[PDB]
Amino acid sequence: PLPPVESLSLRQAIAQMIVVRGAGYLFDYERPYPQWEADQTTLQRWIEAGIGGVILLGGSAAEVAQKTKQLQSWAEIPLLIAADIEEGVGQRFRGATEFPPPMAFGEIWRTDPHQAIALAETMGATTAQEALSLGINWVLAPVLDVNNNPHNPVINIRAFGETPDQVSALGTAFIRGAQQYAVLTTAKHFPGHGDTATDSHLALPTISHDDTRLNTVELPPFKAAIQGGVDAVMNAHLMIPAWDQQYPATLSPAILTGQLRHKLGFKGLIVTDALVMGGITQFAAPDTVVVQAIAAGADILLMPPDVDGAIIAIETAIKTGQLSESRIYESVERIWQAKQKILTASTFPQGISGDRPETRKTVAMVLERATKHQLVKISSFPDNFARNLIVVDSVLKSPFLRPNCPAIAIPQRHGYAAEIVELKTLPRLQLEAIPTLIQCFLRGNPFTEKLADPIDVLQKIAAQIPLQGVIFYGSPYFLEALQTTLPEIPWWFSYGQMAIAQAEICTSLWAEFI
Amino acid sequence: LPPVESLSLRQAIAQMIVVRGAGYLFDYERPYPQWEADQTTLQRWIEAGIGGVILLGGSAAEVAQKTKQLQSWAEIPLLIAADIEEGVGQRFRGATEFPPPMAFGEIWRTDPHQAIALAETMGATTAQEALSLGINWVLAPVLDVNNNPHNPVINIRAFGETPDQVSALGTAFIRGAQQYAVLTTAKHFPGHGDTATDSHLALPTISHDDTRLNTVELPPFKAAIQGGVDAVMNAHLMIPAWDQQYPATLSPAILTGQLRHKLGFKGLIVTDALVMGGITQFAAPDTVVVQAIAAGADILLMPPDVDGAIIAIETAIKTGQLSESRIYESVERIWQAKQKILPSTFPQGISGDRPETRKTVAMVLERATKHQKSLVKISSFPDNFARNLIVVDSVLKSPFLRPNCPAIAIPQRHGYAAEIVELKTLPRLQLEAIPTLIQCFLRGNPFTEKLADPIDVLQKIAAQIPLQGVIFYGSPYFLEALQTTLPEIPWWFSYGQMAIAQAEICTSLWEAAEFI
Numbered sequence A: 001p002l003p004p005v006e007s008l009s010l011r012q013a014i015a016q017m018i019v020v021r022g023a024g025y026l027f028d029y030e031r032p033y034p035q036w037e038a039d040q041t042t043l044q045r046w047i048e049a050g051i052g053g054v055i056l057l058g059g060s061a062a063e064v065a066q067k068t069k070q071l072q073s074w075a076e077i078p079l080l081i082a083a084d085i086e087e088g089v090g091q092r093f094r095g096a097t098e099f100p101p102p103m104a105f106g107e108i109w110r111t112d113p114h115q116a117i118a119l120a121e122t123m124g125a126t127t128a129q130e131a132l133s134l135g136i137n138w139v140l141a142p143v144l145d146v147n148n149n150p151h152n153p154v155i156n157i158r159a160f161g162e163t164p165d166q167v168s169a170l171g172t173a174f175i176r177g178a179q180q181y182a183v184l185t186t187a188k189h190f191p192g193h194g195d196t197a198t199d200s201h202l203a204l205p206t207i208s209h210d211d212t213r214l215n216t217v218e219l220p221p222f223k224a225a226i227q228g229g230v231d232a233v234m235n236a237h238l239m240i241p242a243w244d245q246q247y248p249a250t251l252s253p254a255i256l257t258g259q260l261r262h263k264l265g266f267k268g269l270i271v272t273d274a275l276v277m278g279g280i281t282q283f284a285a286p287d288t289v290v291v292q293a294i295a296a297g298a299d300i301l302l303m304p305p306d307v308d309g310a311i312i313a314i315e316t317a318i319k320t321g322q323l324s325e326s327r328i329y330e331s332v333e334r335i336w337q338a339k340q341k342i343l344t345a346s347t348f349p350q351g352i353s354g355d356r357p358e359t360r361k362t363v364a365m366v367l368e369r370a371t372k373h374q375l376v377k378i379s380s381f382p383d384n385f386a387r388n389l390i391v392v393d394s395v396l397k398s399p400f401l402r403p404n405c406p407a408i409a410i411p412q413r414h415g416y417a418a419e420i421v422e423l424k425t426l427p428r429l430q431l432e433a434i435p436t437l438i439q440c441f442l443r444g445n446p447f448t449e450k451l452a453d454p455i456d457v458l459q460k461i462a463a464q465i466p467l468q469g470v471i472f473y474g475s476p477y478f479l480e481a482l483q484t485t486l487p488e489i490p491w492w493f494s495y496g497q498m499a500i501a502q503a504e505i506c507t508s509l510w511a512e513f514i
Numbered sequence B: 001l002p003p004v005e006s007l008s009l010r011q012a013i014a015q016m017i018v019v020r021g022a023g024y025l026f027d028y029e030r031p032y033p034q035w036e037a038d039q040t041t042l043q044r045w046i047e048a049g050i051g052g053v054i055l056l057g058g059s060a061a062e063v064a065q066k067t068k069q070l071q072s073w074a075e076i077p078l079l080i081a082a083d084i085e086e087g088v089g090q091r092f093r094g095a096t097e098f099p100p101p102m103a104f105g106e107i108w109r110t111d112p113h114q115a116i117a118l119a120e121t122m123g124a125t126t127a128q129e130a131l132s133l134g135i136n137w138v139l140a141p142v143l144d145v146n147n148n149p150h151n152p153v154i155n156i157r158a159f160g161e162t163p164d165q166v167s168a169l170g171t172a173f174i175r176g177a178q179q180y181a182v183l184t185t186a187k188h189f190p191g192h193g194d195t196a197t198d199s200h201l202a203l204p205t206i207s208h209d210d211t212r213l214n215t216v217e218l219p220p221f222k223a224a225i226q227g228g229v230d231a232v233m234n235a236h237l238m239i240p241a242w243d244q245q246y247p248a249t250l251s252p253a254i255l256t257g258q259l260r261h262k263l264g265f266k267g268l269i270v271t272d273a274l275v276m277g278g279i280t281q282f283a284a285p286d287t288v289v290v291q292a293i294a295a296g297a298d299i300l301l302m303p304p305d306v307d308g309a310i311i312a313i314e315t316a317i318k319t320g321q322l323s324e325s326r327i328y329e330s331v332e333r334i335w336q337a338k339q340k341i342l343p344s345t346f347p348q349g350i351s352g353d354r355p356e357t358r359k360t361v362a363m364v365l366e367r368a369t370k371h372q373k374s375l376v377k378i379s380s381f382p383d384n385f386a387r388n389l390i391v392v393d394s395v396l397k398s399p400f401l402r403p404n405c406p407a408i409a410i411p412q413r414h415g416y417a418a419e420i421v422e423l424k425t426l427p428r429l430q431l432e433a434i435p436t437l438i439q440c441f442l443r444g445n446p447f448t449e450k451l452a453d454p455i456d457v458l459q460k461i462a463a464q465i466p467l468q469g470v471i472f473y474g475s476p477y478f479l480e481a482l483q484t485t486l487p488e489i490p491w492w493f494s495y496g497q498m499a500i501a502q503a504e505i506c507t508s509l510w511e512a513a514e515f516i
């Protein structure tokens, strides 16, 4: 059960407003990012001190099930446990179901809205159901950003489309689908990251548009989701000069309170986007940030750089009259209302879809319909006489490439043998001139300063080398420039980078056990 | 367990079979569908009375789920095996990963007493964590003596280059694991140590006489037999001196004569995986299986066709080419082992952060390490000014490389930006000229045609580039060539490829805003 609010000490109350960051992996030494991800002693200590929630990245699903069990066992007040699963729990945690990125659904809506809505619906339902089963009760999604800028490095295919109505529908469908289970759902990133070429992880972006446009494009998904009863809204770190010329949205009273809590009438959790992000740490000190953000009306501080001193800063702000105890508890009340929703509810593996056919088919359907082509069928050759050239953003970021994955195995049956290189390395690579297939896995994500421009390196290569064809996985936006730069060579494209998206494409083109 | 005679001849036969499966809970997750039984097949074969399963892949948590699942379908408890040579964590992450056996041999050169005590800790921690996950059959230690520095498949998987060295370390590992109820397996009799040919690809030819075999190859295996190793796995090797017509796997002279009789091994005699090209190029799947049992094997590991093996056996019993009493002899020995294996529940039993365990791993890596000069430091540069060139065998085969791993992160802080490339791509890559650090993780393993040989391509790069240093992880065998061919470039070497090994070496060369 949940204890009455006023029974908390001012410190326990403040602590609730803080969400820290762990790893899915059980042990300290497995942590990929020890700078940002607390160890067990620090995590237990925080939870026993009343920390409000934990956001987890990394680990197999079976592990997260084990982590969240452990984490919850240290908590007197049940923890909000969040993970960013946009593409489905499978995106974050191997062993759960990964869906194709939202922009894939975007396609289907253009052509067939009634069906697109319904897929997003079960996209949300399944995401919501598997999450509960891993012990994750807070889904930070849907992304409601309207992507108007082909060059947007951070949002890109994470988005349901380029127009507000497309995004409105497909985003509320997802919320509707998840609403079938008890998990918080999160609209992000207010008031939309849609238009920039700049990534707020790297630096502070500025969207120039005025209030008229802002209500015309950026806002409606958000309006829709709030009327929808989305549980939480995560703002981005952005300069919105038409609303505030001083502060980024994270720190602005006019934005978080004036525009959002008041004008749009959002009664849920206003959540700062991660507070360790380059965009914001560059703007102000970690303590200025926490206090100013609460001032601005944020209910939840997501991943503050210094947690121990942040609580202390808020305590000191409260004594110096810069904030008041009542303010803190208004935030607790909202936190209670959401912790109330999550307490009503799955034991791993039970609830994971797995080999369940109905799910596998839904994933395959979405890929198929969202696909884009020129039909053409390419050449076959004898063993290792040809080259399957796989080009990826980073190799440490390419989990979708695994031994015997369709993108490798299939072109191999046909004589092309795989070479895997990073797009940044390619230009400096001297290729044997032999029939060659190029598959680029490239898309936008967090920590992408600018998108991939394979077109130049490719044209150089079409002249140097006998291209059979080029497959693009991930971002669509470079097709326009591909058809224009190289009409000669046929191309195929899919939104999915995953094994089953690979299988579909590669098939259409036509011994090791350990 | 039920009396041995309660089993139908079909179930007796079935106990002699161990099939391959993946740790991942679901079918679509299997990286090797051809060899790895889907969940339906696995359930059918188990209910038919199959002897055991061998698992590959999955995190440790994933695997505990799997094994619980598999034992539930079995009336006779299954042997469940994985090849955890390097610690359960080699296979299923989340469990403990030890540096490879050779690193223990390295220590043994200068300080045998420690090296033996460390090896025993490796054995005990490995048995302990295995039990935790539901893995009762540890296929290890490898007893091969690696004489041949060019040996592709064994390489650093061996505890060393001499019989006395392997016997000591190998038996320690055994005595360590003997603190828990698990089967230990010696591999791969009569030792895969000296060949340049990987038996996964082709049938190795072994020209050594009987005397040489007893001098080098065998003595480790005897030490383990007197030490009580529960099972002995045999290699597919043509040893004419022993059998003119058959590989070790299919030869009664070798398995029955040399192993069972001459060495008096009373445990499980296990074939090497029967899907390997070394054996399959030799005979049809059904001949292979019956000739295997003929020669005295108690366990048929991963027969290429399972259902067809059982038929083929039943038939040969009819024609009396095999014998029914001969099937129950092997079931006797399987009964003896299963008697033993009859734990604790995951995450309990997993060492995790236990500082004794973490220090053991760290000490091994640290005492096994090699560097050209007493101590040397590398220059530092401004951000993204220099090059960190990571060279690996295969990118899909390199799980020790993850985002922000020390090998990437540490040089990064000193201004060397990451570039990852496969050794096969390297000689064709024209390098930008900035001071460069090269780290190649290259080692012997299953499915290796030839040992990766960087010496030539490095030498070419060395003349064209301001090379700061070369670091090798894995196989030691090219260091002499490095030292001779590039005496002016400082080098560092470590047996381990994992985070902790990168961390150690890289830190020593000198003295991120990214969260997702």
Ligand SMILES: CC(=O)N[C@@H]1[C@@H](O)[C@H](O)[C@@H](CO)O[C@H]1O
Residues within 6 Å of the ligand: A055, A084, A140, A154, A188, A189, A193, A200, A201, A236, A273, A274, A446, B516
């Ligand atoms: C614009 C953007 O990348 N937003 C993400 C947000 O979805 C996520 O929840 C959090 C980190 O977990 O902050 C950012 O990394």
Ligand SMILES: CC(=O)N[C@@H]1[C@@H](O)[C@H](O)[C@@H](CO)O[C@H]1O
Residues within 6 Å of the ligand: A514, B083, B139, B153, B187, B188, B192, B199, B235, B272, B273, B301, B446
């Ligand atoms: C020479 C060699 O490496 N043989 C390995 C053996 O180590 C392994 O235990 C077994 C089943 O996995 O068969 C082969 O893959």
